[PDB]
Amino acid sequence: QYPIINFTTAGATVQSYTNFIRAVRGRLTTGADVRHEIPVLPNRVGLPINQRFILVELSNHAELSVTLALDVTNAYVVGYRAGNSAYFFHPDNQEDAEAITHLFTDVQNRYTFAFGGNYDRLEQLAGNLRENIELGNGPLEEAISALYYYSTGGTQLPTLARSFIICIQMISEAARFQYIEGEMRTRIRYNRRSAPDPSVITLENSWGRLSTAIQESNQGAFASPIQLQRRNGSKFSVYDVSILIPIIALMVYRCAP
């Protein structure tokens, strides 16, 4: 009962992964609300529940399948289904907790984690910073297996949390930033897994602030700069939407145009 997109790591290519992320972006928003050439995701206020989520069914060479659910108002993974079980991050407010009761209503076993999907907490559970968790088509293959065998009781929590970290960056963050999408394309192109460097980490960390900066900007000029980092960790300051046009693909709704 929500729109579904399929992606398989089996035989995946730069093109198959790019096609996947481009499909994800187009399901997340129509692109009708654009500010300074960057699409805005739908405002959660007044959004019908039947339009609130999209699904991404992931499959791997082992022929295991899991179905991620993404909230269209923020592009993030809110939970997933494996077989006859569904799992959801702990939402931040009661209203989102009501929203997710509409996901995977057919499954017999439904669980809410005692933790939300924020990186600080996922990293603690995983026992590693994102800096130490390789991304790529191999990591995604393994994360699909981990998520699926979490539903049999096999996969334990650190490996699951690490697998969420992989999925969230390769799907949700790749959707929000064409820069991160490009980072994953390079890993797939050269068939090489590697962890994200600070240029990726600080984009992921600043998506909400960047969204606010842009939407509240004066003709594109940020009221205050936003600090990022280059690949070597050195400071990079953003003053203007202009440099973000090739970087960020989607913003969360923060105000009306």
């Epitope: 909230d71 923020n74 993030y76 809110v78 991050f89 702990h90 939402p91 931040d92 989102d96 939300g116 999907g117 924020n118 990186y119 600080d120 907490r121 990293e123 603690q124 910073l129 800096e131 992921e204 960390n205 600043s206 998506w207 909400g208 602030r209 606010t212 969360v252």
Partner: nanobody, 119 residues
């Protein structure tokens, strides 16, 4: 979310100060905490921050001099400022970001503490 800043104040060049910030409230998906600083006619700059998982960043000019630490049980961060320079004079602001569905769904600032270092 409420932020309580303490510490700071006046110091001599080469002296030491310590800042601390304790968060409370709707805090379950809290992420990075840190300190920005702003001098009277200058741009705000990140001084240091720290994630609940222990990642620490520092402005280049404070490395080897300032150290940040965090206690997740109390949602508190401290900034130990050694070998203070006149250039460290500024209003220092604690910042907390969090969110279950993205890193910085909320972004709260402290009131600001003055730090003044004589040359």
């Amino acid at each position: 979310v409420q932020l309580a800043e303490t510490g700071g104040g006046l110091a001599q060049a080469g002296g030491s100060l310590r800042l601390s910030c304790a968060a409370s409230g709707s805090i379950f998906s809290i992420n990075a905490m840190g300190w920005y600083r702003q001098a009277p006619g200058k741009e705000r700059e990140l001084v240091a921050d720290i994630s609940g998982s222990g990642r620490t960043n520092y402005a280049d000019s404070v490395k080897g001099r300032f150290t940040i630490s965090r206690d997740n049980a109390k949602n508190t961060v401290s900034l130990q400022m050694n070998s203070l320079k006149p250039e460290d004079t500024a209003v220092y602001y604690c910042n907390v970001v969090g969110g279950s569905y993205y890193y910085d769904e909320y972004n709260y600032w402290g009131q600001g503490t003055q730090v003044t270092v004589s040359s």
